[PDB]
JSON list of C-alpha atoms in Angstrom, two decimals:
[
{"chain": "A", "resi": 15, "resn": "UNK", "atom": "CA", "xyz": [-7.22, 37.37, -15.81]},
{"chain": "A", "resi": 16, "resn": "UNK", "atom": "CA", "xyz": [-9.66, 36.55, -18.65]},
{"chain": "A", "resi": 17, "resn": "UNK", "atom": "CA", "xyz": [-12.27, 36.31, -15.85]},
{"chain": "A", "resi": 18, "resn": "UNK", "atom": "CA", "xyz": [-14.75, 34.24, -18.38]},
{"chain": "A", "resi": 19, "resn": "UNK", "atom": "CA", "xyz": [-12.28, 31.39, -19.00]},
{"chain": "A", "resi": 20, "resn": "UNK", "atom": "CA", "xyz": [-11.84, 31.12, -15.18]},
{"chain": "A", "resi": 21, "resn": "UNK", "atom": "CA", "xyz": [-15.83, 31.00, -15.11]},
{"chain": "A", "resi": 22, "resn": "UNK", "atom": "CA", "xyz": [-15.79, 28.56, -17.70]},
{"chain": "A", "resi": 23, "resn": "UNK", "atom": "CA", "xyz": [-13.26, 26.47, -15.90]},
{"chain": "A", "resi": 24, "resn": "UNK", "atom": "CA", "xyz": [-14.80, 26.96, -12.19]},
{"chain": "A", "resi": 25, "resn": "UNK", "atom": "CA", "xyz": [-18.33, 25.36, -13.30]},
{"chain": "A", "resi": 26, "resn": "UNK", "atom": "CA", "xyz": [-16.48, 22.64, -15.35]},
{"chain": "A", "resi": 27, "resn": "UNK", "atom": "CA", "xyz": [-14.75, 21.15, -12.31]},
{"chain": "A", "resi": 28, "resn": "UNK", "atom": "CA", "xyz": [-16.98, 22.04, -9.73]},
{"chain": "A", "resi": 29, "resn": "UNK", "atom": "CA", "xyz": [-20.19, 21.08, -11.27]},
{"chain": "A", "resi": 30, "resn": "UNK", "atom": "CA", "xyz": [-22.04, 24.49, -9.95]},
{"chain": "A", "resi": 31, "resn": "UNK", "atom": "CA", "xyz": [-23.51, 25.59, -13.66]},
{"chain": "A", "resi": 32, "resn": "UNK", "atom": "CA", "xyz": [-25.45, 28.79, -11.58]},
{"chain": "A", "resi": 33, "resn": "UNK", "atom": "CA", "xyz": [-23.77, 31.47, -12.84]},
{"chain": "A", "resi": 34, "resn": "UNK", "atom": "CA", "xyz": [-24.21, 33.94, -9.94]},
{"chain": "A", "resi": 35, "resn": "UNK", "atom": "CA", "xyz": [-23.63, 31.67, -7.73]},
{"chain": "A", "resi": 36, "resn": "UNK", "atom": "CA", "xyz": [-20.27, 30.64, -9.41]},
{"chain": "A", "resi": 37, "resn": "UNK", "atom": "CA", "xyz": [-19.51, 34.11, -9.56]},
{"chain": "A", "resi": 38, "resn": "UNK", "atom": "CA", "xyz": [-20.19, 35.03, -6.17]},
{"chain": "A", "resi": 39, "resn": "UNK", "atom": "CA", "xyz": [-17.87, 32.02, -5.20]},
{"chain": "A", "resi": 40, "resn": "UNK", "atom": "CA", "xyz": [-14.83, 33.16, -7.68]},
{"chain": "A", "resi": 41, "resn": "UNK", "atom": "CA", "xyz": [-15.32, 36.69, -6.25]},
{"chain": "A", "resi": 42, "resn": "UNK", "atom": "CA", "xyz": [-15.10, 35.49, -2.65]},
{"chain": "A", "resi": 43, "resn": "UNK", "atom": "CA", "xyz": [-11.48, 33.68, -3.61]},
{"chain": "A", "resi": 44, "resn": "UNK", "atom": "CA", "xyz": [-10.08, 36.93, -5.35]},
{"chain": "A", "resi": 45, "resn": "UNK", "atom": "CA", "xyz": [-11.13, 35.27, -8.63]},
{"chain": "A", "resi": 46, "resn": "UNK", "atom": "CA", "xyz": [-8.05, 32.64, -7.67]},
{"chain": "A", "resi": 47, "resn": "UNK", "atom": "CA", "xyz": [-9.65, 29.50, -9.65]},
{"chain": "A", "resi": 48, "resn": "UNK", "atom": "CA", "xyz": [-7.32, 27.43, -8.12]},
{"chain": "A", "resi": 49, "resn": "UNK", "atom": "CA", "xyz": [-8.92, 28.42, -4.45]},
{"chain": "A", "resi": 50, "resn": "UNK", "atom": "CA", "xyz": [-12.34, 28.62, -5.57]},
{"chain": "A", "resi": 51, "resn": "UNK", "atom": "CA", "xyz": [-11.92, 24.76, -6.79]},
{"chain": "A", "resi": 52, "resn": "UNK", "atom": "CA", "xyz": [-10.03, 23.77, -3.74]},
{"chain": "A", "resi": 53, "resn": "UNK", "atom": "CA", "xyz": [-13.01, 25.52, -2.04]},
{"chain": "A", "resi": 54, "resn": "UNK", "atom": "CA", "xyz": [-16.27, 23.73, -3.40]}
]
């Protein structure tokens, strides 16, 4: 999955730049960046 592009890409787009908290997010969507976006 290369989970530390997808955290890379999730705090581009969404704007959220705390990392726990953009983990905790990604983790709650099955680390599915597309959800987690569509999500925020």
């Amino acid at each position: 999955m290369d989970r530390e592009m997808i955290l890379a890409d999730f705090q581009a787009c969404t704007g959220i730049e705390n990392i726990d908290e953009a983990i905790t997010l990604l983790e709650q969507n099955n680390w599915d960046l597309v959800a987690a976006i569509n999500g925020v």
